[PDB]
Design an enzyme around this catalytic site. Structure first.
Site, PDB file in Angstrom:
ATOM      1  N   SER D 297       1.354  -0.909  -0.379  1.00 18.68           N
ATOM      2  CA  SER D 297       0.154  -0.084  -0.079  1.00 18.68           C
ATOM      3  C   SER D 297       1.064   1.397   0.363  1.00 18.68           C
ATOM      4  O   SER D 297       1.854   1.179   1.002  1.00 18.68           O
ATOM      5  CB  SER D 297      -0.503  -0.036   1.379  1.00 18.68           C
ATOM      6  N   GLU D 298       0.814   2.292  -0.847  1.00 16.66           N
ATOM      7  CA  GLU D 298       1.459   3.250  -0.578  1.00 16.66           C
ATOM      8  C   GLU D 298       1.792   4.812   0.368  1.00 16.66           C
ATOM      9  O   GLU D 298       2.941   5.336   0.642  1.00 16.66           O
ATOM     10  CB  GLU D 298       1.430   3.770  -2.404  1.00 16.66           C
ATOM     11  N   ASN D 299       0.656   3.983   1.212  1.00 17.71           N
ATOM     12  CA  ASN D 299       1.206   5.007   2.470  1.00 17.71           C
ATOM     13  C   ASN D 299       2.064   4.596   3.341  1.00 17.71           C
ATOM     14  O   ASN D 299       1.772   5.290   4.312  1.00 17.71           O
ATOM     15  CB  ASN D 299      -1.183   5.189   2.734  1.00 17.71           C
TER      16      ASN D 299
END
Ligand SMILES: CC(C)(COP(=O)(O)OP(=O)(O)OC[C@H]1O[C@@H](n2cnc3c(N)ncnc32)[C@H](O)[C@@H]1OP(=O)(O)O)[C@@H](O)C(=O)NCCC(=O)NCCSC(=O)CCC(=O)O
Ligand SMILES: [Ca+2]
Ligand SMILES: [Ca+2]
Ligand SMILES: [Ca+2]
Ligand SMILES: [Ca+2]
Lengths: 464, 471, 459, 470
Positions: D297-299
């Site tokens: 997940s990019e976060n």
């Protein structure tokens, strides 16, 4: 001193297949046509040629398409060259457009030891972002596209990085040369010959007149002979004249345009309607006309007795010259243009935008013309006045919110003169300043492709 | 057509304190001396002048130092100018060196809408890295140093970035002009006047000869009149000759310079275009054998430079890089300084010969003494050794001190990097081959082992012949 | 989930001749020595190695010099490594110096898809202009020189362009890994292992402890497992301590430099001893560039630890409020100007303030280390040196004979006397010792100065 | 040690009108809402805010729109913020998009002394060429457009120049910090708080838990206290959860499911993957057993699990669509600079996302339409312009029948020459030397219907029937 004189066949025998050529000439003026004919006879193939245009059918570079000796052209203008346009559209020839001033200065940079330099010409056009079709497949598909140009900010404005052009051979033509290669050109036939002469490893000059070393005044040499390796003196031959022009709503738009002239301006005029505005200048207004192929003090069409093929204009039409005129090469001509030394430019247009945007160089797929010098004329700081009919020949509005055709220039038009109305591009949007005749502003609202913030409006004057 | 002619005082009256000026001329050749006198008379101050050089005392730009009208000189050369030197050393004036070819092309770029461009000139030198003393304080300490240059790699080689020069005014001199501003220059007095003419907001041309519009052949115009705003036609005057050199070895030291010249003369082959520095390289031109034809280029804008002219031929518009009156041979061509250094930087010389204070096995070359010691200016030398083309250094083997001049790496500031191909001294010829030194030749009066003693690095000494000399 | 554990010999058996390696470690701390031993065993040749240093004789990378397995070292410091210095001077190894923070940021760039980036570090030094001898001939003569760096102006200031480093292999060491390759480091042994672990095609980590997937708190991973291809768990060994320093100058005149709330850096050299002389109620935070804030004096004997060392490889303690970070973050901290003061050792220093403390050509072979990064950030600088070298000559002079670490950067003067300062590009003399004279000082090896407002010393 | 603790009101009081702020948080996770509340009480105006997103209505940065305290937003995403949508449209606020990865790295470069750096992200898009509408006038006209990015070739590939971001203030939230400013974040609430925390001149940190110097293991400080100037401990408040997702049909869903079940065959054992919300995420539910992948997940997470159970929902553990999420054995957390370092340097083996349009080129448009939508680039531009295999999973046409698969994108492009394979309900296409090869078709259709449903020609010589995961 030195003797570089050599016959035509031995001069060009070193040219291998795959070789890169830079070739001088603007249309036919200064096009080394004898040498191209020799390159044809010897049958070299897969040439990559850099040159302003591709000559014309059956003359200069145009000769070399016949047996398909050309792999790729790098060019500013296709011109009257059906075969070049044909070999492009049906996939025999790779065609890379370069703006004419960028091409000239890239050649000069390749002769001058300058690997790259910056210019505002082409920024935000398809010649900077890539994705113009350089090559097609045999059945109409896209095979190759132009690779993007790099960009940099200087003083808050964006520029394109241009690379030095350096070729295996450079082929020039001059009116006069000596045996050690000093060249003197005549008329607008100098053009690219200076920078082409500087950028090739082996340079071959066809001279119309060979003289002894010592007969050229050292102060009137145009291309010092250090730049020239081989001098050839072919059989004399008439230089092809495309348009032998002599003088014993387009006009209407032209007349309003005449009022943009101020006394003491240096101006550049594009081919169609802007040249016609020239005729209507009032008698109390003196301007100096500049032609991009290398002249200030352009005159009107000459008398029959005085037609010279070396004196032609941007539209390849024979021309005279007025008192105090001056000739210069294609590198200096676009130095002068890109440098902002014109006070006014007027151009033709396929489409123009409230954005300050202009599209005048190509209709995708359908009309392949090239940028010529239009991208340099629009990208310098000079006031730009577009002169166009209000709508398309088939009735479409030429003035719109965003341009649908590839753009020649971004944010660059100051004023738009049409036969119906006149607009100033203000703070990124269109403002209506003038209208003519029976036509009302009401009519202007649907003819036009965008709305205009117009508190004020005046009636449109014209020129006698 | 147009009339831009004005009196000398109307032309300069709007130049205000702090103006930037580009001024034409190389030495006194093409130096607008009369406009400079008038600029003295109206007394404007804090001027910033771009020019090839700083004038000589009492002439051209040199006149403006008398009342301290100059704040900054941006220049390639100082040379003869004593008042300037004193002023620089006392903190009265700022002095910023620029390589001559880079100066001419930056003026051109300024007129041509080109914000910056790249050049191999000055790469790896003190003019690239910053720290040449540009201003002294009022008691002989360093107040300001030179701004550095950005650089960028193209094709594996390093290049400096150079910025357009645009000035408020440009002052040029021409042999001939018409009323709409077209200029025609005479001789090597063209030089910087073309690019200077292009880069100013207001350009002022002094002409020795005024003619009417139509009197100049469109084909023979050197600066198109679009560039010129104001043309002035002052009372005729003699352009100052710096060195009246005319044509019509007696010492031990002069014989070592003659020996090196006589060896340097065998580097010439038929069909070469050459640049010779003043001194030994220039002296070697006098021993070229009878069959060998070369053409000399002068950086102030000539190819086909001949020897000093006879007394009946001396001409102030014809001078060489050392400001000496010269002649010219059949096949000669004149060009402006932008073209001259395009020609040079683009490697169109087949042979470039100059002297050196220090030369290294690197191939690095030094021509300037320790900075803050003695002031020279780069002139055209940095442009000349960066040409990418055959450089041959002709110099004595050691300082008079005994210290070697050929060393591993330069201790003196570099003129150019990895550029020397051959070193010719009075005892030896060296080649620079893959960044290392190879002894090719030795004079009759030494041996290899003494050459070793005399040089500050080792070298390949496997194939050495006896050094020949031109007759 | 995933299991990347391998035996030691299998993990490295596919390293081929001429392979490029990036290797973590700072001196011996975090240096993957067991992996370096296996690479010696397997006999690979012509290796090109990017690392902060080259270990030490008989340890980590040092081991690979023994059968001349290395062709080129790209490094910031040689350290206490005789065989590396020897093989360099004898034309056996190429040595390309790279400033420590650039080296760390270039490895992060190559893992992060950034081809290049800009830094003020090394501008106007011999590492920007080429001309650092990178390779000698067998007879003491130059053969290769460093190739120069591009530069560019941003906001009126000049920066160097640094190119991303991508290697065939990265070799790292960690206190702890799981099977899917998540690593956790301990003390200042983290250092380059994070950026090294990101820049390799095939990355191999020796762990001192292997745990199952799920045993490492997700919030405590230092090198996410995605970066790790192979985890090796050697037989446990003692990490080498170069200088086992224990308790049982900060500058007498630079004590005053210290305020409350300052973050201060101490470089390798005399600066390090200063951590043992912090005044009692002064309250500053010491930074060590190998990746610590809250550095303290040398530890008591029972608390020494090879994972807590300083820039000079001395064992160190840490105070309350200490924080450990990797070498990429360490030099971002420094380069970004988050230090309030830096203090450095010297080879020589000049009156114009430019300083040299990194090498003397052909004789003292040292490296720039983090020195070049420390002098060219925003931060106030102060030098600490003996007044003369062992040959009894001035360490302070008018202009630097030796290559510069950075230009116009030094503000302070501690030696066996002090005070000078640079304002608007020139030194202004600020304090005089006791009631003694300007003239002793005026016999300045270097320059003229302002004496209008001189005053007595607080020491 | 040092003590930087202060009251909330005295910490924000130094913020003057016109100030630049960098603000951490992704969605609501790690958003300093209590400080935002306090910037609203003190009434400062003309703010310029750099943040991943623009907050939500009535929370974090969203609160500042209420009294028109914001002049300019530089963000990667707008999302569920209505006040801001209206204000942008009615000319009250300037909006400059930046790709998320470029934003994070600019902030880091700001804090790290790096004035600029290069990235393949946004090359050949409107974010490089200029002409994003950034400010309207009061009546629907264009007032400002975006300034272009410089570009440069390295090894024959073009990159964008990105400039450092340095703000007057930086505002961050952390789970725990000490008095001297060492911070520890929790879950995916770390995200931008690390690079935001480094780029501000004055940085202010709200911590949910204050402890003493020496209470935090030095080996597990996420933001060292040298970057923090002021620490603030508000009254404890619950973090807004945007989407409380938990784990305990129509023809439209059947289409997306078929696309999901073909996309599931793109996975191979050992891959790390980034999956767009929608069909690509759905496809992970049909992964054949014995194929194990790690979701990113990019976060700031690898090892993302499915939605949590009701007792394990946690506002600090969300994905890129801001849905609450669990994590699996061997997961790892990291900040947003490291997230996009990981993406941009090509460390995913497969990236899968939707598209509004895809080209025979490999060009993809899925982030914008001029004057018609504002979502922003998000992380999509970064995800598609590294050299990682990109697979587009999308319906074959628009609901009106206009092809989504065309010769050249009419829509503004997200990435240039980057899609490898296209999976629809009808066909699978490979992009090969800049054109489409038809690899597979559904049992449901024919080669002649796909010719009719797609806006370009393609090679249909070696087509096979489309398989599906069970
Ligand atoms: C600090 C120094 C300058 C060493 O200086 P010291 O404080 O130890 O002073 P010192 O003991 O008096 O001198 C150390 C050695 O230098 C020699 N020396 C000193 N001055 C000299 C001179 N003028 N001529 C010849 N030799 C000289 C002395 O003989 C001594 O060697 P003997 O006693 O043996 O005779 C060096 O290590 C250095 O600075 N390296 C660059 C890295 C740096 O500056 N670091 C700052 C960031 S920390 C870093 O970058 C390093 C990180 C890392 O290590 O990886
Ligand atoms: Ca040639
Ligand atoms: Ca003018
Ligand atoms: Ca890997
Ligand atoms: Ca701060």
């Amino acid at each position: 001193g030195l003797d570089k004189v050599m016959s035509l066949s031995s001069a060009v025998q070193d040219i291998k297949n795959g070789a890169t050529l830079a070739v001088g000439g603007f249309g036919t003026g200064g096009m080394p046509h004898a040498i191209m004919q020799e390159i044809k006879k010897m049958g070299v193939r897969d040439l990559i040629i850099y040159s302003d245009g591709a000559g014309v059918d059956g003359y200069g570079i145009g000769v070399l398409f016949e047996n398909k000796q050309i792999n790729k052209m790098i060019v500013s203008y296709v011109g009257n060259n059906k075969i070049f346009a044909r070999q492009y559209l049906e996939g025999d020839v790779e065609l890379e457009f370069c703006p004419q001033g960028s091409l000239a200065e890239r050649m000069r940079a390749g002769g001058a030891g300058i690997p790259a330099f910056y210019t505002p010409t082409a920024v935000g056009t398809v010649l900077q972002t890539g994705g113009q079709i350089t090559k097609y497949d045999k059945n109409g598909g896209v095979l190759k596209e132009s690779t993007p140009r790099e960009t940099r900010f200087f003083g808050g404005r964006l520029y394109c990085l241009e690379n030095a052009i350096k070729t295996d051979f450079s082929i020039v033509k001059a009116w006069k040369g000596d045996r050690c290669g000093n060249l003197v050109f005549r008329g607008t036939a100098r053009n690219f010959n200076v920078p082409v002469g500087q950028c090739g490893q082996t340079v071959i000059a066809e001279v119309e007149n060979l003289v002894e070393n010592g007969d050229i005044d050292p102060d009137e040499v145009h291309l010092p002979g250090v730049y020239v390796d081989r001098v050839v003196v072919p059989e004399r031959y008439q230089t092809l004249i495309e348009h032998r022009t002599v003088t014993r709503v387009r006009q209407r738009i032209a007349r309003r345009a005449a009022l943009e002239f101020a006394n003491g301006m240096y101006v550049n005029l594009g081919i169609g309607i802007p040249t016609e505005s020239s005729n209507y200048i009032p008698a109390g207004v003196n301007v100096v006309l500049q032609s991009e192929n290398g002249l200030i003090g352009m005159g009107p069409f000459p008398t029959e007795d005085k037609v010279d093929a070396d004196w032609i204009n941007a539209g390849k039409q024979t021309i005279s010259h007025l008192a105090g005129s001056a000739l210069f090469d294609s590198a200096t001509s676009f130095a002068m243009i890109r440098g902002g030394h014109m006070d006014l430019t007027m151009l033709g247009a396929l489409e123009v935008a409230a954005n300050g945007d202009l599209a005048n160089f190509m209709i995708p797929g359908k009309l392949v013309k090239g940028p010529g010098g239009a991208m340099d004329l629009v990208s310098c700081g000079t006031r730009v006045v577009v002169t166009t009919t209000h709508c398309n020949k088939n009735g479409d509005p030429k003035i719109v919110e965003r341009c649908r055709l590839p753009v020649t220039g971004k944010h660059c038009v100051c004023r738009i003169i049409t036969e119906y109305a006149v607009f100033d591009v203000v703070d990124g949007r269109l403002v209506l300043k003038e209208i003519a005749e029976d036509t009302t502003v009401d009519q202007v609202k649907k003819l036009t492709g965008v709305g205009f913030d117009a508190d004020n409006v005046i009636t449109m004057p014209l020129a006698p």
